């Protein structure tokens, strides 16, 4: 009564080799699940993190390489343009030839980089103003500095676009880094040395005089500027309530309530806004509605910005763009980035060029590349099996509402309404295969030169930004998928109320039509519940069946939700992570993803139970003295085998909304009565605490 199928001994092989039986699963189910993997493997020098998810991603890139690298005679133009962009990206001879000179020719278009410019005040500083310089950077190149203004979906009306104003991203991974002490010191030092190294090469290439002291001096200035910007930004934790974040305002209110004085403006929001939108030829008057996400950042900006020269501002502004660009130049410019990324990521080397390039084309031509990927790599009847799976887990969520004692009937039923209304996207959109005209036309307006990678990348920045801006007055496309298909991941959009499972994750260990159902439910099954449960986490409960930010909770049920979820805030917030020097997880910033995990695991388990009810129990797997309840959780766990470099652990504890994989396992199974049953765990065994968190 052992299954002896080749597909059976495949997954058994994988389960066996990853796990370590020497460990008591009730003591540390991560070590049990994954201890075999830990011992056998080492984080490559190019990886900040490694494990099964990351391995799937390296394997996906291999297919991408196979599909991109060989011209084919009946390649439609869409595929021809991706291949040419790939070839343009992997030709380092051509790139190295060009030195920095494609940067040098850019710089005049963004009002210069002062520290690397003679007589900048004369050249640029006379025409300069904040409104134009920020706007140029924003509209043409999609780099948002100082004040991030973008066109996105209106949270309170999901068919429309609105102008938003938000705080800008920083050059270091999180506001925390800018303390620049302790675990942060080297990142801070490498950052400014990076500035300095880049200003130096530019100066040398322009054959300008180099004074190390005035470089150190301007670039430290830029750091002090951004420190202030950083401290002015709002924490993630003050930003996690979308009803509070949503402040709709007329450009006219904005002008009255958020004055700025830059280089002695003073600052004019209408001009700023028009200097952006005039680029898709759109007209803004002071009656425009705007969603302001960081009112308090803007208020705080005021007395900071006043202190600094036009030269100072622009030295930061341009740096934040040049940052990104420098690894698309010659080796010496690539070199200049070494210590910085070592500090942030721990890696001693860059990823293979072909891999970077595959990934880049994927990210800029996701439909073109998803079509090639799925034709190479994805099965087709997979789509049908997952759909039915998704239908099952959706039902279980609905049916579960009835057992949840912390909601009221009105709220439950509105929650039902939302479930049923979730839109599922599976594998890929048929169109990218069956409609060449459509596929070609999405890239019509791009044309790549094979010896011109940098110009290609620039063209994509401008194209993408022009396209985004063009949306202001147009309706949101209800057909758009929120991920390419060539992605190892799944997704939920609140704005759209849509779950998506790209072909790339539809493979072992999450899914195969031929592997045991225990495994599929514990794999893609729990992924499905994760994504659906996002519709009802601390963010996505605030949006209704239609993707609109509107309150559909009673006060009591909402207050209960906070109460139930607070348990997970504390649980995870109480994990400390050796690889990040004992620092604790942020229990608030991971909350949503933690809720998704615990809700999703439970949902999937329930569906598997239902499956057994209906269908009977499964042939066992050879090599493994475990039943299928046990394998369900094993495979759940092994999804997350892996580990982190210290430097990157320090990064993601702050910047990742996910808990690290080991604690997604630990926290989730800790909360799972069904787990301690399967493995016969004594009370208050580490994996079986008396107190268990539950929301969904
Ligand atoms: C891999 C990891 N993703 C996930 O954990 C799951 C998808 C997933 C759920 C459960 C088990 C495996 C994968 N997806 C997610 O949690 C969210 S809804 C998707 C997301 C994408 C980018 C940033 C943040 C979130 C990651 O993006 O770092
Ligand atoms: C790379 O580009 C250079 C410069 O145009 C060219 O000489 C060479 O043929 C290209 N190599 C490949 C393999 O495309
Ligand atoms: C913005 O104001 C500046 C003032 O220097 C002016 O030169 C420019 O034409 C204005 N732009 C728009 C789009 O109104
Ligand atoms: C740990 O949990 C306790 C209560 O269970 C809570 O008071 C404390 O704040 C938590 N620690 C952290 C850092 O979250
Ligand atoms: Zn998630």
Q: What are phi and psi of 161, to 5 degrees?
A: -105, 145
| DSSP string for residues in 49-87 | EEEHHHHHHHHHHHHHHHHHSS--TT--HHHHHHHHHHH
658 lines ligand 1 (CB under 6 A): yes
Strands 498-502 and 491-493, bridge-based pairing = antiparallel
Nearest to 64 by CA among 267, 356, 451, 265: 356
163 and 84 belong to one structural domain = yes
Contacts for 456 with CB less than 8 Å, ≥ 6 apart: 85, 88, 89, 448, 449
Contacts for 457 with CB less than 8 Å, ≥ 6 apart: 325, 328, 360
**How many domains, the chain?**
2
From the CA of 491, how far away is ligand 1's center (Å)? Answer: 7
Protein residue with its CA nearest to atom 5 in ligand 2: 451
What's the rounded Cα separation, in Å, for the pair 289 and 382? 45
| DSSP string for residues in 182-193 | GGGHHHHHHHHH
List the CATH number of the domain containing 16. Answer: 3.40.390.10
* Cβ count within 10 A of residue 414: 16
List the CATH number of the domain containing 178. Answer: 1.10.1380.10
From the CA of 663, how far away is ligand 5's center (Å)? Answer: 15
The resolution in angstroms reads 2.3
534 marked as part of a ligand binding site: yes
The DSSP 8-state label assigned to residue 403 in this structure reads G
The DSSP 8-state label assigned to residue 485 in this structure reads S
Task: Quickly list H helices, 524-583.
Answer: 526-533, 555-573
The answer to whether 131 and 146 are in contact (CB under 8 A) is no
282 and 423 belong to one structural domain = no
Tokens of 219: 């670039």
Q: In what order do the strands lie in the sheet with 498-502?
A: 423-427, 498-502, 491-493
What's the rounded Cα separation, in Å, for the pair 663 and 488? 21
282 lines ligand 3 (CB under 6 A): no
> What ranges make up the beta strands (E) of 366-454?
423-427
What's the rounded Cα separation, in Å, for the pair 619 and 519? 12
Most ligand 4 atoms within 8 A of CB, residue of 573, 659, 692 to mutate: 573
Given 61, 597, 618, 647, the catalytic residue: 597
Give the method used: X-ray
269 and 412 belong to one structural domain = no
511 lines ligand 1 (CB under 6 A): no
Looking up tokens 């979906």 gives 153
Range of the domain at 195: 51-377+430-476
Q: Among the bound ligands, name the one nearest to the CA of residue 282.
A: 3
Decide which of 445, 476, 507 is a domain's last residue: 476
615 and 673 belong to one structural domain = yes
* Cβ count within 10 A of residue 226: 21
Give the DSSP H or E segment for 491.
strand 491-493
**Cα 403 from chain centroid (whole Å):** 34
* Cβ count within 10 A of residue 483: 19
Decide which of 439, 460, 476 is a domain's last residue: 476
**Cα 314 from chain centroid (whole Å):** 28
The DSSP 8-state label assigned to residue 328 in this structure reads G
Nearest to 436 by CA among 448, 444, 428: 444
What's the rounded Cα separation, in Å, for the pair 365 and 79? 9
What's the rounded Cα separation, in Å, for the pair 596 and 437? 39
Nearest to 292 by CA among 170, 159, 150: 150
490 and 460 belong to one structural domain = no
245 and 347 belong to one structural domain = yes
594 and 496 belong to one structural domain = yes
CA angle 470, 476, 477 (to 5 degrees): 105
Task: Quickly list H helices, 490-544.
Answer: 517-520, 526-533
371 and 304 belong to one structural domain = yes
Contacts for 337 with CB less than 8 Å, ≥ 6 apart: 194, 326, 327
What's the rounded Cα separation, in Å, for the pair 490 and 502? 7
452 and 338 belong to one structural domain = yes
Contacts for 89 with CB less than 8 Å, ≥ 6 apart: 353, 356, 357, 360, 361, 453, 456
225 and 258 belong to one structural domain = yes
Report the b/e string of 301-340 with b at 16+ CB within 10 A. Answer: bbebbeebebbbbbbbbbbbbbbebbebbbeebbebbbbb
From the CA of 475, how far away is ligand 3's center (Å)? Answer: 29
460 and 484 belong to one structural domain = no
The answer to whether 527 and 488 are in contact (CB under 8 A) is no
The answer to whether 505 and 564 are in contact (CB under 8 A) is no
250 and 351 belong to one structural domain = yes
Phi-psi label, residue 385: left if phi above 0, alpha if psi -120 to 50, beta otherwise: alpha
């Amino acid at each position: 009564g052992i299954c002896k199928s080749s597909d059976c001994i495949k997954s058994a092989a994988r389960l066996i080799q990853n796990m370590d039986a020497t460990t008591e699963p009730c003591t540390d189910f991560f070590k049990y699940a994954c201890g075999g993997w830990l011992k056998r493997n080492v984080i490559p020098e190019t990886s900040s993190r490694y494990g099964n998810f990351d391995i799937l991603r390296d394997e996906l890139e291999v297919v991408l390489k196979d599909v991109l690298q060989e011209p084919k005679t009946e390649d439609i133009v869409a595929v021809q343009k991706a291949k040419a962009l790939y070839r343009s990206c992997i030709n380092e001879s051509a790139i190295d030839s060009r030195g920095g000179e494609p940067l040098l020719k850019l710089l005049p278009d963004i009002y210069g980089w002062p520290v690397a410019t003679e007589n900048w005040e004369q050249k640029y500083g006379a025409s300069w103003t904040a409104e134009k310089a920020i706007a140029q950077l924003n509209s043409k190149y999609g780099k948002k500095v100082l004040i991030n203004l973008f066109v996105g979906t209106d949270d309170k009306n999901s068919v429309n676009h609105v102008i938003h104003i938000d705080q800008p991203r920083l050059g270091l991974p999180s506001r925390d880094y800018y303390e620049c002490t302790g675990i942060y010191k080297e990142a801070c030092t490498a950052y400014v040395d990076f500035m300095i190294s880049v200003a130096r090469l530019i100066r040398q290439e322009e054959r300008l005089p180099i004074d190390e002291n005035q470089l150190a001096l301007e670039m430290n200035k830029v750091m002090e500027l951004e420190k202030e910007i950083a401290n002015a930004t709002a924490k993630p934790e003050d930003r996690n309530d979308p009803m509070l974040l949503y402040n709709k305002m007329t450009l006219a209110q904005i002008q009255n309530n958020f004055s700025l004085e830059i280089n002695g403006k003073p600052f004019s929001w209408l001009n700023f806004t028009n200097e952006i939108m005039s680029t898709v030829n759109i007209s803004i008057t002071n009656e425009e509605d705007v969603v302001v996400y960081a009112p308090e950042y803007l208020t705080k900006l005021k007395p900071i910005l006043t202190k600094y020269s036009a030269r100072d501002l622009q030295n930061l502004m341009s740096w934040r763009f040049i940052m990104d660009l420098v690894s698309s130049l010659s080796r010496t410019y690539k070199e200049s980035r070494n210590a910085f990324r070592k500090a942030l990521y721990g890696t001693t080397s860059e990823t293979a060029t072909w891999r970077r390039c595959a990934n880049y084309v994927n990210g800029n031509m996701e439909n073109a590349v998803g079509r090639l990927y799925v034709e190479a790599a994805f099965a087709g009847e997979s789509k049908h099996v997952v759909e039915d799976l998704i239908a099952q887990i959706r039902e279980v969520f609905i049916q579960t509402l009835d057992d949840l004692t912390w909601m009221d009937a009105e709220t439950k039923k509105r929650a039902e309404e939302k479930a049923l209304a979730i839109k599922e996207r599976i594998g890929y959109p048929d169109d990218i295969v069956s409609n060449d005209n459509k596929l070609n036309n999405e890239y019509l307006e791009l044309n790549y030169k094979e010896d011109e990678y940098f110009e290609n990348i620039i063209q994509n920045l401008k194209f993408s930004q022009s396209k985004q801006l063009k949306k202001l007055r147009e309706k949101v496309d209800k057909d758009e998928w929120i991920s390419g298909a060539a992605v190892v991941n799944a997704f939920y959009s609140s704005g759209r109320n849509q779950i998506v499972f790209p072909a790339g994750i539809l493979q072992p260990p999450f899914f195969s039509a031929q592997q045991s159902n225990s495994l599929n439910y514990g794999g893609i099954g729990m992924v499905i519940g994760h994504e659906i449960t996002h519709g009802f986490d601390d963010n996505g409960r605030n949006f209704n069946k239609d993707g609109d930010l509107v309150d559909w909770w009673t006060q009591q049920s909402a207050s209960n939700f906070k109460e139930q979820s607070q348990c997970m805030v504390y649980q995870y917030g109480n994990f400390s992570w050796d690889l990040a020097g004992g620092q604790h997880l942020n229990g608030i910033n991971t909350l949503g993803e933690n809720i998704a995990d615990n809700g999703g695991l439970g949902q999937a388990y329930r569906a598997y139970q239902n499956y057994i009810k209906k269908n009977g129990e499964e042939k066992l797997l050879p090599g493994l003295d475990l039943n299928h309840k046990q394998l369900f959780f094993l495979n759940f766990a092994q999804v997350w085998c892996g580990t982190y470099r210290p430097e990157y652990a320090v990064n993601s504890i702050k910047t990742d909304v996910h808990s690290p994989g080991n604690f997604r396992i630990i926290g989730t199974l800790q909360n799972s009565a069904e787990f301690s049953e399967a493995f016969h765990c004594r009370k208050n065994s580490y994996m079986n605490p008396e107190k268990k968190c539950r929301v969904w």
